[PDB]
Amino acid sequence: GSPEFLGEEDIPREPRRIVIHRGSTGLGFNIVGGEDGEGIFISFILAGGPADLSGELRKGDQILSVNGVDLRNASHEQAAIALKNAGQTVTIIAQYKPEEYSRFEANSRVDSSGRIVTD
């Protein structure tokens, strides 16, 4: 049978809830943004870290809130503090915003499925 590749399918752009149980370890991702009230975006997911293990976050996701704390207009340092101090159970509302994200990373653009491509 002819194979069905996930790479063709559009990445969902609606907000999602992600609950990460990480005890007293790092979440395992990097954030960019929070200067200009641009928003807080995931720039990197660590292999094997709690965010990776969730399978529900990706580079280009905007972090809308953590544990009900709205980060849409957060400053960078306060966003990091909110995340680091969120406790063992971390409830993130995230929304995939690859076009906005692509402005941060050099030579990056969005293809027809919404995937971020770096040349």
């Binding site: 990097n30 954030i31 943004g33």
Partner: peptide, 7 residues
């Protein structure tokens, strides 16, 4: 834009 933090 420039800051990046691991969390």
């Amino acid at each position: 834009n420039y800051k990046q933090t691991s969390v």
